[PDB]
Design a protein around this ligand. Structure first.
Ligand SMILES: Nc1ncnc2c1ncn2[C@@H]1O[C@H](CSCC[C@H](N)C(=O)O)[C@@H](O)[C@H]1O
Ligand SMILES: Nc1ncnc2c1ncn2[C@@H]1O[C@H](CSCC[C@H](N)C(=O)O)[C@@H](O)[C@H]1O
Lengths: 341, 341
């Protein structure tokens, strides 16, 4: 039946409702002061009455809000997010979709046809990857990492629960960004020490992330190019978090070989990101999130299958290669290998 | 729970997958030559293999396609559209979303906050309505009406099944666009004669629609401004198809009172468009489609509730006012009235 096509055919509109609910302060208002009538919403949020009605209709029909009494409350997924302490995280990733993902997504068809990340044209600069363009605009880098920080807060529980971090001590965070994951690791495991490797632009945000955690003595930054520069020696654990999704399989092989050469024998390699199921049918998250990867970061970015990643670890020379999957939310998992002695 | 938020959070990406499947010719390919391997798709569609994989994961995960065999076929909603002869309709409304709706949708938050159709900025010009701006870009007016045509072909069976058309003979099509509905009515009812009222630019497309149905002697075009000019006298029936959703309630009143003055006493008024449920909870189609009306056509545009429409008819002076809401056809219906003798 073709009624089924309506939510896809209007998917962008569906997103815009969540976008508006967040940006316009609806969900937080309902959280602190619900239930509220449409006219109370309009007055609170300073919206024209027609505007509140349209918004409330949008969020109510999607299940983001519920209406009884002619009074409005947050719906179950929203209320759930508040309950679990995940609202600022949810709010921030929505901002990201809005400010970073949405408009480049329009270049999806061209990006597929030409194999280019055509969506990057919306950002000043001439380099062919998104990250080296973040520096081109004042405050852009900070906005981007506010986003990434939040995505990792959402997905790094599976990382933090990784058995290896009770057994390793010195982690190399390759492309560690704003050091969100270094810090989360350092906090959960006081034994641990982490080197955050990234572009200088990222590391300026990293220092601030490190400084407000007071983790300057166990978490440090090091500026390098992940391809052309050497990975710092004397590390126990090489971590790739939301990294290998950016590059082609051959580039990934290159990165993993550097991980191998640099890591202490008996050490571990960890690949942490979303993964496409090996049967290529999902999950929905990877399937959808790939529109971002096809249009923006780099021309070969895509969410790879577990089996493909595992293959790269073995062909880099790692052993004991395997995966850690379920939490629930999402396809985030860890693929891991050991450097043999 | 927040897994639920995923299709909304990536709502724009879901649409883009559908968008790509249409534009790149995937669904048509699968229809005539499925089942196919990923690599067969890649070669046929002239896509890089990595592109074919990313696309196929998206459509498969969405159910737009299915994978068994390791061979790909159209999923149920897509195949159903082909079987029912609705494929070109689906194709054209997807093209309309892509070229007309998707980017102005980003101006939703701003549109809500200011009560303006802020999305109109994506179109060259300075007038306050979308329709008078279409001529500024070559082929835009026709591309637009190609889009309107396809939407009406999808929803006007409820209109064609409206009982009044066995009791009326001369219908006035107020804001009749490319005459998709005038022609469809004339076909369904050989008794009928229709006057299509619209801007000259629209009527140029209307003439063509009329000519290729060969209905030039029963369906004619008349250039007028629906607000500042009088409606032609001597009509049995005044029809508003996808029209009142554009204007404010005060404006809808002005238009309906004009219909009142122009229609023969004992004549009928028909308002045909999508409707919002009186309980303001849905349907989803109306709730989402509002993103387009808030951002693009005009500063007051919105999908009104049945009851609000009914109320305007009665206050314009019509009697016997009621609704027709065929099951399966939601959110499309007709609100109708009579001019008293
Ligand atoms: N050539 C390069 N040298 C250094 N860092 C690079 C790089 N190419 C990409 N990166 C970094 O790779 C990161 C991708 S985003 C992931 C950031 C962080 N690990 C997290 O999980 O939240 C960005 O910080 C980008 O600056
Ligand atoms: N001031 C005006 N005068 C005449 N036509 C107008 C108008 N403002 C809007 N319209 C027309 O209103 C229509 C809105 S779209 C509806 C088209 C047609 N009724 C259909 O159902 O397919 C457009 O054709 C637009 O040109």
């Amino acid at each position: 039946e073709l009624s089924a096509l309506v939510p896809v055919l209007f998917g962008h509109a569906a997103f815009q409702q969540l976008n508006a609910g967040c940006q316009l302060g609806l969900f937080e208002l309902l959280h602190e002061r619900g239930p509220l009538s449409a006219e109370e919403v309009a007055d609170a949020l300073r919206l024209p009455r027609r505007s509140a009605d349209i918004l409330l209709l949008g969020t109510t029909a999607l299940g983001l809000s519920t209406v009884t009494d002619g009074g409005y409350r947050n719906g179950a997924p929203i209320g759930a997010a508040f309950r679990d302490g995940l609202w600022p995280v949810l709010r921030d990733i929505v901002q990201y979709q809005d400010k970073i993902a949405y408009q480049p997504a329009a270049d999806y068809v061209e990006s597929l046809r030409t194999g280019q990340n055509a969506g990057i044209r919306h950002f000043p600069g001439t380099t062919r990857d998104l990250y080296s363009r973040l520096a081109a605009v004042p405050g852009l880098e900070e906005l981007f990492y506010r986003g990434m920080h939040a995505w990792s807060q959402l997905s790094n529980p599976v990382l933090l629960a990784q058995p290896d971090f009770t057994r390793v001590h010195r982690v190399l965070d390759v492309g560690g960004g704003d050091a969100v994951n270094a810090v989360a690791l350092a906090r959960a495991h006081p034994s641990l020490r982490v080197t955050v490797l990234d572009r200088p632009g990222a590391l300026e945000v990293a220092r601030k992330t490190i400084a407000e955690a007071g983790l300057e003595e166990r978490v440090r930054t090091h500026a390098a190019d992940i391809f052309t520069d050497s990975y710092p020696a004397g590390h126990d654990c090489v971590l790739f978090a939301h990294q290998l999704v950016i590059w082609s399989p051959e580039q990934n092989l290159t990165l993993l070989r550097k991980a191998y050469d640099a890591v202490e024998p008996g050490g571990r390699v960890l690949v942490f990101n979303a993964f496409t199921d090996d049967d290529r049918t999902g999950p929905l998250y990877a399937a959808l999130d790939n529109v971002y990867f096809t249009t923006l970061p780099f021309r070969h970015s895509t969410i790879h299958r577990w089996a493909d990643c595992e293959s790269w670890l073995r062909e880099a020379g790692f052993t004991d290669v395997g995966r850690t999957a379920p939490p629930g939310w999402t396809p985030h998992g860890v693929v891991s290998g050991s450097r043999p002695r």
